[PDB]
Design a protein around this ligand. Structure first.
Ligand SMILES: CC(=O)N[C@H]1[C@@H](OP(=O)(O)OP(=O)(O)OC[C@H]2O[C@@H](n3ccc(=O)[nH]c3=O)[C@H](O)[C@@H]2O)O[C@H](CO)[C@@H](O)[C@@H]1O[C@H](C)C(=O)N[C@@H](C)C(=O)O
Ligand SMILES: Nc1ncnc2c1ncn2[C@@H]1O[C@H](COP(=O)(O)OP(=O)(O)O)[C@@H](O)[C@H]1O
Ligand SMILES: [Mn+2]
Length: 430
């Protein structure tokens, strides 16, 4: 696309906004950037030639724009952005800009949970085939930083927020892995509005890959499906990955475990197949992939205690996936809390009954989580306080699990900081 001579306004001075600034500048367009935060994290990394407005959205700048580029962290429903849209001013995000430029096939992955895992897996499958692959998006490397003429395949993790502002994605293979309550602070019309944002990913996708066990992943010829007991890609039994009844991998060969990680492997294989990656090398990558930091990651096993960093469990579904069927020989010391994004945490309570569960609840919505079972729950302001509280009580056989069911931004830079903090404190206290 062409942007020369346009009045371009970027909203958001985080990672996305800064990548958009660099994007336009490299194309001969000087954009202006604003953020409702008074002191946004990217202020200090902004080029000095770039005009910036902080502490509010500036309607003089918005209502004058030819193009508004909204970071995923600002809601389209923000009154200033809603007014601009009412005026017919074009609003896109960074993923829209990327799609307009990308010259290699795109595999696009969304869903409430599992996105980074499946995105990284498909990347490893492409690397195993010797494809020059660019991996990014909501996983943490801004998509515009991937644009590379040597790049042969893009694998994008996409959030529902990113999809809201995207209209030119025509993925070679796209999936919604699952849809469970999340981000309700951004979706005032509830689960179906959130789902609608995710269903945009299938528009003009060559192959759509759905979860046969989750109806909300399905759009309106047919999608390929993956599932546990059913699907074009499904599980057999010892557990096997199968594709239409044919065994392709005994999961004893994988470094990941857990049923959701087996279905993540199925989804990743389905996308890789659809993108044309040779299956042999795709199966190889499944055997080498070790798992991402902060995703149910054992950070210390000492004195008979496992300290597990599941900082990236930021909603009920992911903490459910950690707890469901969890084996602990002694007591589970479970750290919960942070910014609950208006989630109903109730579905967790059925996992927290019985004699060997202690809760340590903190952050903005700590009180909400302690309420899940008040008789075994402690509430502190911070995670560090909770950890210094639980640490004396830890016995051989116990597990200390940070699986907070919340976003981290009420107290942390990012979920990685929260995970890294937990790992430092576990090393100190364990
Ligand atoms: C909130 C969000 O969508 N974050 C993704 C974003 O990071 P970035 O630093 O660009 O975020 P941003 O859009 O500036 O928003 C960050 C925070 O600033 C606050 N914010 C932002 C703009 C503004 O004017 N006012 C404001 O208060 C936001 O509400 C938001 O909570 O772009 C990065 C590159 O694509 C992503 O890796 C990053 O994913 C993280 C890890 C995330 O938490 N994403 C959410 C959606 C999730 O996975 O659930
Ligand atoms: N398919 C799945 N369903 C439910 N939880 C999952 C699934 N895959 C992974 N998890 C959990 O989701 C949380 C974040 O995983 P991740 O791969 O980073 O997904 P996302 O990028 O969507 O948050 C981690 O706690 C992890 O164990
Ligand atoms: Mn999310």
């Amino acid at each position: 696309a062409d942007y020369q001579g346009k009045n371009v306004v970027i909203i958001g001075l985080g990672l996305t906004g800064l990548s958009c600034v660099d994007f336009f500048l490299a194309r001969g367009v000087t954009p202006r950037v604003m953020d409702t935060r008074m002191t946004p994290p990217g202020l200090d990394k902004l080029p000095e030639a770039v005009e910036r407005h902080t502490g509010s959205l500036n309607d003089e700048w918005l209502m004058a724009a030819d193009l508004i580029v909204a970071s995923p962290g600002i809601a389209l429903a923000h009154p200033s952005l809603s007014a601009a849209a009412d005026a017919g001013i074009e609003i896109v995000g960074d993923i829209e800009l990327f799609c307009r430029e990308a010259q290699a096939p795109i595999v696009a992955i969304t869903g409430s949970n599992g996105k980074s895992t499946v995105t990284t897996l498909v990347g490893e499958m492409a690397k195993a085939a010797g494809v020059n692959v660019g991996v990014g998006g909501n996983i943490g490397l801004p998509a515009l930083m991937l644009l590379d003429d040597e790049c042969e395949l893009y694998v994008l993790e996409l959030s529902s927020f990113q999809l809201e502002t995207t209209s030119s994605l025509q993925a070679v293979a796209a999936t919604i892995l699952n849809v469970t309550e999340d981000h309700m602070d951004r979706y005032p019309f509830g689960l179906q509005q959130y789902r609608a944002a995710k269903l945009r990913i299938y528009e003009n996708a060559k192959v759509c890959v759905v979860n046969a066990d989750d109806a909300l992943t399905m759009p309106i010829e047919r999608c390929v499906s993956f599932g546990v007991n059913m699907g074009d890609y499904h599980l057999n039994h010892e557990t096997w990955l199968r594709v239409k009844g044919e065994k392709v991998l005994n999961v004893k060969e994988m470094k990941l475990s857990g049923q959701h990680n087996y279905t993540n492997a199925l989804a990743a294989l389905a996308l890789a197949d659809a993108a044309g990656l040779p299956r042999a090398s795709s199966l190889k990558a499944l055997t080498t992939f070790t798992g991402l930091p902060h995703r149910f990651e054992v950070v210390l096993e000492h004195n008979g205690v496992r300290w597990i960093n599941d900082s990236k469990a930021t909603n009920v579904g992911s903490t459910e996936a950690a707890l469901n069927g969890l084996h602990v020989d002694g007591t589970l010391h479970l750290l919960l809390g942070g910014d609950g994004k208006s989630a109903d945490f109730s579905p967790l309570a059925r996992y927290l009954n019985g004699d060997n569960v202690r809760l340590y609840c903190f952050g903005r919505d700590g009180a909400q989580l302690a309420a899940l079972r008040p008789e075994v729950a402690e509430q502190t302001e911070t995670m560090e306080q909770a950890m210094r509280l639980l640490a004396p009580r830890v016995q051989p056989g116990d597990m200390v699990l940070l699986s907070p069911a919340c976003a981290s931004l009420d107290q942390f830079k990012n979920f990685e900081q929260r995970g890294n903090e937990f790992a430092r404190l576990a090393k100190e206290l364990g």
